[PDB]
Design a protein around this motif. Structure first.
Motif, PDB file in Angstrom:
ATOM      1  N   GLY A  10      40.262  40.268  43.676  1.00 46.13           N
ATOM      2  CA  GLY A  10      39.626  41.369  42.992  1.00 46.13           C
ATOM      3  C   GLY A  10      40.054  41.421  41.569  1.00 46.13           C
ATOM      4  O   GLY A  10      40.061  42.472  40.958  1.00 46.13           O
ATOM      5  N   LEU A  11      40.368  40.270  41.029  1.00 43.43           N
ATOM      6  CA  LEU A  11      40.965  40.198  39.729  1.00 43.43           C
ATOM      7  C   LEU A  11      40.013  39.740  38.671  1.00 43.43           C
ATOM      8  O   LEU A  11      39.318  38.729  38.825  1.00 43.43           O
ATOM      9  CB  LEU A  11      42.208  39.301  39.753  1.00 43.43           C
ATOM     10  CG  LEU A  11      43.355  39.773  40.647  1.00 43.43           C
ATOM     11  CD1 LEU A  11      44.498  38.778  40.626  1.00 43.43           C
ATOM     12  CD2 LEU A  11      43.840  41.141  40.214  1.00 43.43           C
ATOM     13  N   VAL A  12      39.942  40.523  37.636  1.00 48.86           N
ATOM     14  CA  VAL A  12      39.249  40.165  36.431  1.00 48.86           C
ATOM     15  C   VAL A  12      40.168  39.293  35.533  1.00 48.86           C
ATOM     16  O   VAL A  12      39.753  38.199  35.130  1.00 48.86           O
ATOM     17  CB  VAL A  12      38.700  41.410  35.647  1.00 48.86           C
ATOM     18  CG1 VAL A  12      38.081  40.998  34.320  1.00 48.86           C
ATOM     19  CG2 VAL A  12      37.673  42.147  36.487  1.00 48.86           C
ATOM     20  N   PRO A  13      41.438  39.729  35.211  1.00 44.56           N
ATOM     21  CA  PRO A  13      42.334  38.938  34.408  1.00 44.56           C
ATOM     22  C   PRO A  13      43.211  38.015  35.260  1.00 44.56           C
ATOM     23  O   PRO A  13      44.147  38.470  35.942  1.00 44.56           O
ATOM     24  CB  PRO A  13      43.203  39.988  33.679  1.00 44.56           C
ATOM     25  CG  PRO A  13      42.897  41.310  34.340  1.00 44.56           C
ATOM     26  CD  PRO A  13      42.094  41.001  35.569  1.00 44.56           C
ATOM     27  N   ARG A  14      42.870  36.746  35.277  1.00 41.46           N
ATOM     28  CA  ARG A  14      43.647  35.742  35.969  1.00 41.46           C
ATOM     29  C   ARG A  14      43.355  34.383  35.357  1.00 41.46           C
ATOM     30  O   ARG A  14      44.277  33.621  35.043  1.00 41.46           O
ATOM     31  CB  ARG A  14      43.372  35.739  37.484  1.00 41.46           C
ATOM     32  CG  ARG A  14      44.347  34.882  38.261  1.00 41.46           C
ATOM     33  CD  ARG A  14      44.117  34.973  39.754  1.00 41.46           C
ATOM     34  NE  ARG A  14      45.175  34.285  40.494  1.00 41.46           N
ATOM     35  CZ  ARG A  14      45.445  34.448  41.799  1.00 41.46           C
ATOM     36  NH1 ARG A  14      44.605  35.128  42.589  1.00 41.46           N
ATOM     37  NH2 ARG A  14      46.523  33.887  42.319  1.00 41.46           N
ATOM     38  N   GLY A  15      42.084  34.101  35.142  1.00 37.04           N
ATOM     39  CA  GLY A  15      41.694  32.862  34.515  1.00 37.04           C
ATOM     40  C   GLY A  15      40.209  32.614  34.594  1.00 37.04           C
ATOM     41  O   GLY A  15      39.526  32.542  33.569  1.00 37.04           O
ATOM     42  N   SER A  16      39.698  32.499  35.792  1.00 33.87           N
ATOM     43  CA  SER A  16      38.303  32.202  35.986  1.00 33.87           C
ATOM     44  C   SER A  16      37.520  33.488  36.283  1.00 33.87           C
ATOM     45  O   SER A  16      37.964  34.315  37.071  1.00 33.87           O
ATOM     46  CB  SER A  16      38.140  31.154  37.109  1.00 33.87           C
ATOM     47  OG  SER A  16      36.781  30.749  37.282  1.00 33.87           O
ATOM     48  N   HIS A  17      36.369  33.622  35.613  1.00 35.14           N
ATOM     49  CA  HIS A  17      35.406  34.763  35.670  1.00 35.14           C
ATOM     50  C   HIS A  17      35.924  36.028  35.002  1.00 35.14           C
ATOM     51  O   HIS A  17      37.131  36.267  34.903  1.00 35.14           O
ATOM     52  CB  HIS A  17      34.794  35.104  37.113  1.00 35.14           C
ATOM     53  CG  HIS A  17      35.658  35.903  38.114  1.00 35.14           C
ATOM     54  ND1 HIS A  17      35.735  35.611  39.449  1.00 35.14           N
ATOM     55  CD2 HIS A  17      36.445  37.001  37.951  1.00 35.14           C
ATOM     56  CE1 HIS A  17      36.531  36.469  40.046  1.00 35.14           C
ATOM     57  NE2 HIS A  17      36.972  37.321  39.159  1.00 35.14           N
TER      58      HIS A  17
END
Length: 215
Positions: A13-20
């Motif tokens: 459910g992550l927006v800030p991580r790397g992809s997308h």
């Protein structure tokens, strides 16, 4: 307890991580006592065929009446979104307008008068949402899922779900996955608009890497 640590996530459910930046979710309505449409109303095409390759504007009555058949004795009236076991979604007039305000393409609205479990019309401006542009798309090679909860097109266990944007145009903000009736994928934007709108209830599961959660 006794399975060690099986290498898997609990989704992200992550927006800030790397992809997308835009995260994808499975659209479900968190409404149990609202009552799922257990059994098909008058004029309805088959469970799986509802959004299977076609629009229902020619097959489902436009401006007609439908009703919840009492398969289950309990359950209340309708919410903004009404869940069901089939490949069709029921949306209120106000929630309809939300989806239209985002400019969600491939959406068709079939308005009818919906009578709830009690047989009373409580959905007068409700419309069934059709997702078009569906063509067999679900990755079935990388997506760990067990099929057949009721029929072949009903997925039960999901360990991993890979996006079906491989065959369906990825520009769609909301679409439905082919080998499952209830699997409707929405973008972050779609439910984000619902969060702020303050609508009845939603249940989201991650579409990307859907781990162990049941739609």
């Amino acid at each position: 307890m006794g399975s060690s640590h099986h290498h898997h996530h609990h989704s992200s459910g992550l927006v800030p991580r790397g992809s997308h930046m835009v995260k994808y979710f499975v659209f479900k309505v968190m409404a149990e006592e609202a009552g799922y449409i257990e059994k098909l109303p008058n004029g309805s095409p088959t469970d799986w065929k509802f959004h299977e390759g076609i629009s229902l504007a020619k097959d489902f009555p436009v401006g007609g009446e439908v009703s919840f058949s009492k398969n289950y004795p309990d359950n209340r009236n309708l919410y903004d979104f009404q869940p069901n076991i089939m490949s069709n979604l029921l949306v209120s007039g106000r929630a309809r307008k939300l989806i239209e305000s985002l400019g969600v393409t491939n959406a068709e609205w079939l308005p009818v008068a919906i009578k709830d479990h009690q047989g009373k019309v409580v959905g007068p401006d409700y419309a069934f949402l059709n997702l078009l542009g569906a063509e067999d798309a679900i990755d079935m090679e990388r997506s760990e899922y067990e099929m057949d909860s009721l029929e072949k097109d009903q997925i039960g266990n999901i360990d991993a779900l890979a996006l079906d944007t491989s065959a369906i145009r990825p520009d769609a903000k909301m679409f439905r996955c082919t080998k499952e009736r209830r699997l409707i994928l929405i973008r972050e934007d779609v439910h984000a608009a619902f969060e702020q709108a303050g609508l009845t209830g939603f249940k989201v599961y991650e579409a990307e890497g859907w781990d162990g959660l049941e739609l």
